[PDB]
């Protein structure tokens, strides 16, 4: 309603007037039209809540029944943001509350850069969120759209031996290949980490070396 497309609720949270917010979302009941109002950056009150690390306000917005699946200008659902920022509380609220099978959908959705929640969590090093997302039902072998990479590939790409270990501990398939036909192991050539190359040399012999010609 304001200038940047923001409503009073948006401001209620943006300036961290929890009190006001707690109330606005209380005085104004179950009205989606306003609870799912998106601004010019296509953010909803829920998005702003988690971006500004206010779990409860988000927990409230959800309680009042807002939509957990609306995407921001980057194609992100609030959970995506929660995982991208590493806020473990927000993650909890956004996954504990809507226990609805909508979770499966969210965990399945990628943003405009082709990234799922697990992917965003893995891109930064939030192993705790990564492992939580997996026990919640996110598919560790989910492939990214641009090249068909799995969290495991990204792990090699990010040279993060701890992420690698976690993913293998979660049953990640070391022989899943990218669209170029490559295994995580095969992305190690040219990269410095020998630790990673050790953690992975338990994948098909036919998926270890590059090719010539």
């Amino acid at each position: 309603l304001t200038e940047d497309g923001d409503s009073f609720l948006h401001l209620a949270i943006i300036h961290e007037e929890k009190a006001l917010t707690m109330e606005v979302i209380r005085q104004v009941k179950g009205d989606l039209a306003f609870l799912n109002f998106q601004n010019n950056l296509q953010q909803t009150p829920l998005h702003l809540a988690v971006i500004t690390n206010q779990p409860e306000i988000a927990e409230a917005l959800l309680g009042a029944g807002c939509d957990p699946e609306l995407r921001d200008f980057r194609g992100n659902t609030p959970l995506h943001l929660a995982c991208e920022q590493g806020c473990l509380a927000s993650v909890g609220v956004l996954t504990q509350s809507c226990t609805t099978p909508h979770l499966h959908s969210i965990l399945k959705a990628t943003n405009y850069n082709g990234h799922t929640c697990l992917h965003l969590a893995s891109i930064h090093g939030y192993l705790g969120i990564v492992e939580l997302l997996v026990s919640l039902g996110a598919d560790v072998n989910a492939q990214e759209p641009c090249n068909g990479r799995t969290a495991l590939h990204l792990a090699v790409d990010l040279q993060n031996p701890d992420l690698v270990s976690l993913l293998l501990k979660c049953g990640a398939d070391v022989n899943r290949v990218t669209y170029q036909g490559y295994s995580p192991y095969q992305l190690t050539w040219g990269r410095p980490s020998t630790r990673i190359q050790q953690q992975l040399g338990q994948l098909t012999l036919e998926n270890l070396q590059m090719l010539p010609e």
Binding site: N40, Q42, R71, F73, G75, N111, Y112, N113, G114, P145, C146, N147, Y179, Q180
Partner: protein, 107 residues
Amino acid sequence: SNLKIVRMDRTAGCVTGGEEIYLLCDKVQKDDIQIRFYEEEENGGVWEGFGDFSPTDVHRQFAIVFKTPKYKDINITKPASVFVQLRRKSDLETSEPKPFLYYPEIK
């Protein structure tokens, strides 16, 4: 002989089209190749759009730089998923579909 899209710098785009994309692929010939965007419709027909580019945008036979076609409805408010594929002109053979996401224009 086989057509394959092995990589794209981006797989989502604005419905308004015109956005530039880098695509890596198996061997193709600059004058016998096209990038077809398509979406199955209710009535069984199909909406299709073609990536815009010139054979000189086909790089050393293994990548194509091109711009996205405009989606059939630049008003949608929710993203619309479609398919993208390489298609050879001489035999109309095509690569396996890749999934492409068209998001609303935020105006």
